Amino acid sequence: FNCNKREGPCSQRSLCECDPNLQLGRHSDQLWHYNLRTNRCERGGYRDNCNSHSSSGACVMACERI
Amino acid sequence: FNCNKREGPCSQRSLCECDPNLQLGRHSDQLWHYNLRTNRCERGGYRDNCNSHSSSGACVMACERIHHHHHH
């Protein structure tokens, strides 16, 4: 399933299940990513990685589960 | 469709059809948004608006390419 925002769409799956450490595009400390091991969003994102989010609240809604 | 990223998911349509001027979350100069009238990705976006993108390339692919090809 696609993880590069430049190369195809990002499924709802991809937003949370893409490895956030894939260095796709420049890194930004103003973006956020979901950590599937901890079930928490954390600061930082690679801007062309499907698992990169524009805000913490965007990431929480997209990916964090109870 | 939903446009508030904090309150629900963003559909593929919402990425491109949400009004990019809707002031949902704090503005960021480094985000991008899609202008549906001109079919062009432009600089700036509001962090909690579904039409806010992490890079120009992300916006181009989702909106100038995919949405523009399919939406009718």
Residue B54 near residue A54 (C-beta atoms within 8 A): yes
Element of type H or E holding B28: strand B27-35
Instruction: Please choose, from the candidates A2, A22, A23, A15, the residue with its C-alpha nearest in 3D space to the C-alpha of residue A41.
Output: A15
B12 SS3 class: coil
According to the entry, how was the structure determined? X-ray
Residue A32 near residue A63 (C-beta atoms within 8 A): no
Domain containing B24 equals 1-72
Q: Which B-chain residues 10-69 have CB contacts (< 8 A) with chain A? A: 12, 25-26, 28, 30-31, 45, 47-48, 52-55, 57-58, 60-62, 66
Query: Cβ contact (<8 Å) for A25 and B61?
Result: no
Give the integer Cα–Cα distance in Å for B19 and B69. 19
Documented resolution in Å: 1.6
| Residue B2's CATH number | 4.10.410.10
Write the secondary structure of B40-70 as one string of H (helix), E (strand) and C (coil). EEEEEEECCECCCECCHHHHHHHHHHHHHHH
Domain count, chain A: 1
Instruction: Please choose, from the candidates B26, B27, B28, B42, the residue with its C-alpha nearest in 3D space to the C-alpha of residue A28.
Output: B28
| B47 vs A contacts (CB less than 8 Å) | 54-55, 58
Question: Taking the CA of residue A49 as centre, how many other CA atoms within 13 Å lie in the half-sphere pointing to its CB?
Answer: 23
User: Which residues does residue B4 pair with via DSSP β-bridges, in sequence order?
Assistant: B49
